[PDB]
Amino acid sequence: EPIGEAPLPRLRLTDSGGKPLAFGLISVELNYTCDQDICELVVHVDGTDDSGEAVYRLLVGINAPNLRVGSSVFLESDLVTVGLAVDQIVGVDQRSENFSVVGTLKLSWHDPKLGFSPDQCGCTVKSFEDASIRAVAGEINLPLPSFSFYNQQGNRWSQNQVIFVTPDGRASYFERFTVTLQAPDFDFL
Amino acid sequence: VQHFTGYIEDGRGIFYSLPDSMQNTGGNLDPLVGIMAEEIDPAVSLGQVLEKALASENDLISELTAVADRIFLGWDDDGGKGYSEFTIPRDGTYHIFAGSTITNQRLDKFQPTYTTGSFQLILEVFASLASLEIKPEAHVQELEIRLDKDTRYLTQHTRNLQPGDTFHALVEPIGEAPLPRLRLTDSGGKPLAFGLISVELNYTCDQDICELVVHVDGTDDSGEAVYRLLVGINAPNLRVGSSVFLESDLVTVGLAVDQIVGVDQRSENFSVVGTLKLSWHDPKLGFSPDQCGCTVKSFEDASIRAVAGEINLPLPSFSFYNQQGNRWSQNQVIFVTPDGRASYFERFTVTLQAPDFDFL
């Protein structure tokens, strides 16, 4: 329901494949019960049909006819911690406008889908060495936080690449790089 | 049993009436089954629901069920693995109907549209095709050609025919008639029919797969062409309908230049940095969201040529004409939608030979 300046918003409830499943009823409310073995929902909020801000509060629940803490119902994106350190500046090209840098990059995130059991390995940490995040993700068929350098020119020399995962599900990445980056914003006037 | 197998267009109907389980083989099709007796014209009412879409008003689901109640006495949809018997009140001839449903397959917005694809119906002597649709329905197309002298020989390709389908072609010059010669051969070049002197010819094929190629020869000095070629299927009259000749895909292309890295004045080449984008529509690339639970497919860090070999489908491969050496490609990706729309994106750093430099 809107807070102020109500524009009569339109809401929809479709399947994961876009097939509609339920429609709103005029404080727009709607209900739906699914009986299939696997049942995934997507909530659509449309405002295409000049307005001042949004001022909206959306309430959803499962098996909660009353409504109006509990547990989270919507999917939440993973949170990634990132750090970068610069060790050297190899050179600067003043004609092609690019520079070379040497440094260290570290990533870390938590994902319960990567967990395992120590019984089947007799080990605490898993190892994937000399492989990028993209290559490892294809091997284990799991989504991973692939990254790239935006203004990279040519290939880069990567050293000490490694990923380690713990039984809880915490993973991290480490790499030492030597890269050349294009910088067209140089001004030598 | 022997079941059945067929193809479904944007809007059509296949019936399997018997005088005495549906699956999606591949494509965008959303199977639907009808068991209404005394078939007259079900497709008329379905278009009304699609026209002036009132899904955003109250609901499209309720309207579809209401209209299907009038048309059909019993029916069910088809989603995933059998997600969605009649009543046999007395004797008679059964009726089986199809023609997809009204559904949405995108998350950015809400566009209800029909679906097309191929299906494998799984509904002893029980296999028989009995369609009430108009068999003599014609696909007549007219176009103008130009031979002159730049291209003496012209050929056109015809879509697949049917054993019960006949082909008729007609052509005649406008002025300065040179008595043109026309031929009709197979896809492999084997002749099938010959012209008869306003050259006309007819041919009927009965094989399971029947593909035709139309040959127009002008080799045997003339002023222009001034020709009008008329062809049709199951149209003995001749003299809009649907297209009969194959049409090439249309590709939209854009290029943007971001920087000029350098210029070599001795070898005459320059280096550039930019962005390239391509997009085209191809129904053969469509899929069904049920088998993936997703809207877009992904092919990352692979060129168009590499992806085409993987999926065994023709794709618009391209190249830089004057490229020297290798080029640094970044952010290569292709994404396809269930409808069939695909696009390409890439950031490049290339060196191109320019022998037209003049530093005088």
UniProtKB/TrEMBL annotation, chain B:
Annotated binding of Ca(2+) 4, by residue: E268, P355, F357
Cystine bridges: C205-C210, C292-C294
Residues that hold Ca(2+) 2 according to the record: D30, D77, D78
Residues reported in the UniProt entry to bind Ca(2+) 1: D30, P31, D77, D78, Y83
Keywords, alphabetical: Calcium, Metal-binding
Annotated positions binding Ca(2+) 3: E268, P355, F357
Positions bound to Ca(2+) 5: E268
Name assigned to this protein: Uncharacterized protein
Organism annotation: Desulfofustis sp. PB-SRB1
Upper classification of the organism: Bacteria, Pseudomonadati, Thermodesulfobacteriota, Desulfobulbia, Desulfobulbales
Full protein stretch here: 38 to 439 of 642
